[PDB]
Design a protein around this ligand. Structure first.
Ligand SMILES: [Mg+2]
Ligand SMILES: [Mg+2]
Ligand SMILES: [Mg+2]
Lengths: 252, 240, 311, 252, 240
């Protein structure tokens, strides 16, 4: 009688597992039936040019995140002031704003007409900066939140003691706080990188040309059809499984 | 009075207003769970500024000072051993202000003075309850602490073990002539270590002195609390 | 509330807004679904992305033929004309001294940025390049297209017995000197680039330049591809799109059609009819786009041979 | 001296806060300078048609998530079998696959060509179903993970006792487990809904026309330029601030 | 022997192999922290199947049975009061198999038999340490438990309070004639309540019997552990 509930749960859960598996799986599967194209795609240096631009651009957003996001994540896990409610909301803004809008909004500020752009002698549009700013905005919250849980996990006493043993707030931070939440900062970073990499909407609208993996696929999809994009898709899928399972095996 | 503390602190529906004088010996304040013992210590510690009042240590006002510039050695319930650091590095933390070789000296010196110099490479988890307690103390002492705060440093420990440990505390205190403010809810500990005994109840330190005195002079509050002697006496009767 | 799918060129956007309300104002229970996208691309929605549409409208009526016959369709109707101009904003670099004789010189300045859509996707795209090359023959300056495009892209025109041709790369292989030329899939996208300040000038239809009140230089009809009286000169340049099709300089003539897979033929017809009726022709002319009166078809059309004379 | 570190942190953190604030903020600000267009946009029933399609389509992905995702989230927080490592990874697939690819991959399964696409009477392409499947795939992990932390928060003993008091695993689940992690299931759901709503890439490639707010903006951006999209953007921004701050005030 | 337990269980570097007979009275097994006391109880409880061996209750083999079909009343360290449920609903949980009005009867009957019938509407947080203990017991008893498992049900409690509480346990047991398997690391509790005393050390239940017997018959292991009597005796001397 209990196998019915034990299976009901097992069944329902094995469904979404296939749902999320089938597509990804299938597309890479079928890349056998046309291993010629797949191989060519794999060799296509146009792809690799994009892949790198992608990975590298997203890697910058992450660093920017860690570098500015961490401090905030600490402040959120520890101190509690009147504003918080707001500060916490601002951090989650990007999660509610659809990709496209994000891009548009970003454009309204980093384009040569933007409050910021009109000053930044660094050009954003159709430039890494743009891509960065795009990816950043969309992944910043993702990092911060993870970084927060990090600091949140560290026993405050540990920090108390550390000051007790005569250690400035600054000392404590780098010797107790940080080192202890590293496995969260790291995870958070990796996660924000996966976010940047996966972004399409926010990006396309700011800088189209220094082309990103997501775009190159969309273009070929529209330009040559489905069967002309599958290869690049599968390449990008596999390309990711590797990079991430790799990272996991280098942390767990 | 080596340590004087007159201060008020509000925290929710909790109010901590104390008047506490302390010797240069082994003080021990008794108090049920939730009497304010831990904040009291964080106060002395300088990990909590009081709303009103001050904390004098050696006649000198310490309140404006940071937990870092005060000399106090702090130890929180279930010790705060840095889990990402080896026994050695744990003990060494707090000496970043000392010459290198000198630091290593002091470290190993204390590591030996506490019989842990062999665990110098392990990390907190590999340590036994007792091993922690030692590392804890080790790291707290190498700083040549003006004072030494502890709370429930003996909770979650079998009676059998407790006794041996208490004797070790007595020793450590006589050995390093380091005054100690030990906080618990257990009479057995007060009775076994204290040179003086305070008694906290609801953030207020009702009375201090010596156990014997505290009993006789029954005021129906501290009297009630210290009435546990009967159970300790009934038990001694029922055994051996 | 049956939906009416209509994919169309990017410039037919304002116009289509009008066509929409009007048409719906006639069948208040049907919703018209518009979709901007450079003609070539717009047609690829039907021919490659496996989607279905009820109406297809291009800025180059020939693309329909060269890309939909006879599998995805079999009849085109000319319904409008257009002109290629060099647009800009009041502030754009040298918006003062520029004019119909120096434009090609201004654009040569190293500090000036101009853009044009992608030939492989949008007609305005190759029409722009056509016009720049046609200028070489009109001002007798065999460098213009060389100085403004080849020296800033892997795009190149090559003569053969008085004529010219440009072989288009895959859109991903298109290499652009990002310091001089910004390009996009469709001319309408050239709009935000201008607004957000990243462009000084852009080759766009006059129809649109007006629609968005852009400052603009009127080019010599001998090159702006806007007159039958000059089809001769226009015919001198020809570009080959990556999808392997050939497009020749001709007067800009918009075509429209109802595909083979079209799900609502009858509602389609009604829409098309409206496009060519006076209402439609005025709509267009209102928006500064010269309609083609009277309409034309490359073949007798069943439900429309009454509104269109096969010319 | 400590104000330098206390401010260093405060400064760095006040930066990303502006970064994430400025754009969103600015665009809605400027919607005053052209309150006419803003108002018109606001009235444009074309917009509201989309907004609803969006919200409603995303609402379905969520329900599907809760209904199939929860069971898996429980199983992940409780039981620990040999497979887990894999099962857990499959759940996170979508986080690594860029939007576009997701769409393409999804298409390969519900698109006329692919397996189910054919074997299914219900057309997905250019239809609501494609949208759901799109949004689902992208938000499923987001829910599951939150739902997991939910069950993870419940003291196992509570469940032990519940069985002790003679309650079947099934009983326990709905009486102890669930009710106790409700504030996580709810949060998780809300979060997955915000994800669907914000999706662009995965969706567009499956169903460009029964369109969602992210697309309508992209279209206008391309069709009429920046200044023609800002209004709709700002509307969507505000439209979200409301819906979410509302939800927060109805939970905190 | 009401409850017999002979079984082995492997959990990491931990091995639990016990041979335990138990009366129909108040048993109490002493053991340091980490002796396997809690798993031992989860074993009896049926919340952990053993690798090898069985759990007999009333001569009948219970091992194959589920914690739900066993009659045992379980109570885990720092009681598992359902925080989302009122005292009433807490007590009521476990009676879903009883008629409504009858349930309400039994509940209030027990709510009164434990002096909490007034807290029937509050929820766990509003409860004092003592109030919890009662609700805990209340809910554990209304099921008319075949047995009654408890562990450290008296930890984190001031000596003074402990005594009063212990007397309440004695009473509750004499009052409901419910055998009780009480698990602790504190002699004082063993000495004050047990009719029999077991002693666990490293997953193995070394010896059972009566305290007095356990001392004299010194085997250097249980002898060492029960040697804490000295500290209890020294303390009784130093006080009153
Ligand atoms: Mg405390
Ligand atoms: Mg030339
Ligand atoms: Mg235990």
């Amino acid at each position: 009688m209990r196998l019915l509930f034990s299976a009901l749960l097992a069944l329902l859960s094995s469904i979404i597992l296939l749902f999320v598996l089938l597509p990804v799986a299938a597309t890479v599967t079928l890349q056998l039936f046309n291993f010629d194209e797949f191989l060519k795609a794999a060799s296509d240096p146009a792809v690799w040019k994009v892949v790198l631009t992608t990975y590298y651009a997203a890697l910058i957003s992450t660093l920017i995140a860690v570098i500015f996001g961490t401090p905030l994540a600490y402040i959120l896990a520890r101190k509690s002031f009147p504003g918080k409610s707001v500060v916490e909301g601002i951090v989650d803004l990007p999660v509610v704003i659809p990709h496209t809008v994000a891009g548009i909004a970003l454009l309204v500020v980093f384009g040569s007409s933007g409050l910021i752009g009109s000053f930044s002698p660094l050009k954003f549009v159709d430039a890494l900066p743009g891509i960065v700013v795009a990816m950043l905005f969309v992944s910043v919250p993702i990092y911060i939140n993870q970084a927060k849980e990090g600091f949140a996990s560290v026993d405050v006493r540990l920090e108390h003691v550390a000051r007790t043993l005569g250690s400035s707030p600054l000392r404590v931070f780098f010797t107790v706080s940080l080192p202890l939440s590293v496995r969260h900062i790291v995870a958070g970073a990796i996660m924000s990188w996966a976010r940047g990499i996966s972004e399409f909407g926010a990006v396309v609208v700011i800088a189209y040309y220094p082309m990103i993996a997501p775009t190159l696929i969309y273009e070929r999809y529209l330009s040559e059809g489905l069967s002309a994009a599958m290869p690049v898709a599968a390449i990008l899928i596999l390309l990711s499984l590797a990079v991430f399972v790799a990272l996991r095996i280098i942390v767990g | 009075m080596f340590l004087k503390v007159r201060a008020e602190k509000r925290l929710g529906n909790f109010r901590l207003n104390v008047d506490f004088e302390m010797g240069r010996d082994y003080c021990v304040l008794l108090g049920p769970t939730g009497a304010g013992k831990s904040v009291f210590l964080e106060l002395i510690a300088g990990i909590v500024k009081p709303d009103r009042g001050e904390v004098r240590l050696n006649g000198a006002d310490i309140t404006p000072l940071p937990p870092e510039r005060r000399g106090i050695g702090f130890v929180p319930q279930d010790y705060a051993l840095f889990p990402h650091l080896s026994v050695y590095r744990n003990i060494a933390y707090g000496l970043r202000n000392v010459e290198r070789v000198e630091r290593d000296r002091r470290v190993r010196e204390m590591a030996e003075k506490l019989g842990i110099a062999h665990l110098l490479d392990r990390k907190p988890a590999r340590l036994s309850g007792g091993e922690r307690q030692r590392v804890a103390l080790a790291r707290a002492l190498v700083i040549q602490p003006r004072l030494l705060l502890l709370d429930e440093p003996l909770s979650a420990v079998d009676l059998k073990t407790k006794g041996v440990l208490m004797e070790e505390l007595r020793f450590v205190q006589r050995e390093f002539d380091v005054p100690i403010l030990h906080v618990t809810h257990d009479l057995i500990e007060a009775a076994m270590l204290a040179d003086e005994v305070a008694v906290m109840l609801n953030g207020r330190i009702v009375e201090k002195g010596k156990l014997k005195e505290l009993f006789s002079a029954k005021n129906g509050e501290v009297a009630e609390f210290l009435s546990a002697r009967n159970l300790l006496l009934k038990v001694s009767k029922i055994l051996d | 509330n049956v939906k009416l799918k209509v994919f169309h060129a990017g410039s037919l956007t304002e116009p289509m807004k009008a066509f929409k309300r009007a048409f719906e104002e006639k069948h208040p229970n049907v919703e018209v679904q518009t979709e901007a996208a450079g003609s070539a691309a717009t047609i690829r929605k039907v021919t490659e992305l496996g989607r279905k549409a009820d109406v297809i409208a291009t800025a180059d009526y020939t693309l329909i033929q060269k890309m939909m016959y006879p599998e995805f369709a079999n009849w085109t109707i000319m319904f409008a004309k257009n002109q290629i101009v060099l647009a800009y904003r009041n502030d754009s670099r040298y918006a003062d001294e520029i004019n119909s004789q120096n434009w090609y010189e201004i654009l040569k300045r190293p500090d000036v940025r101009f853009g044009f859509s992608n030939p492989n996707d949008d007609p305005c795209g190759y029409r722009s390049l056509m016009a720049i090359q046609l200028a070489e023959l009109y001002y007798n300056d065999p460098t213009i297209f060389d100085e403004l495009v080849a020296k800033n892209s892997n795009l190149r025109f090559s003569e053969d017995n008085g004529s010219y041709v440009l072989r288009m790369p895959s859109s991903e292989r298109i290499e652009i000197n990002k310091s001089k030329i910004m390009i996009r899939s469709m001319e309408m996208e050239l709009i935000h680039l201008v607004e957000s300040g990243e462009l000084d000038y852009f080759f766009i239809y006059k129809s649109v330049a007006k629609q968005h009140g852009f400052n603009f230089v009127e080019l010599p009809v001998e090159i702006d591809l806007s007159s039958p009286d000059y089809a001769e000169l226009y015919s001198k340049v020809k570009v080959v799109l990556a999808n392997g099709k050939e497009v020749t300089g001709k007067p800009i003539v918009y075509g429209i059609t109802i595909p083979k897979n079209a799900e609502n033929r009858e509602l389609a017809v009604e829409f098309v009819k409206l496009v060519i009726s006076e209402e439609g022709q005025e709509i267009l002319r209102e928006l500064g786009q010269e309609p083609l009166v009277p309409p034309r078809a490359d073949t007798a059309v069943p439900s429309l041979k009454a509104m269109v004379e096969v010319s």
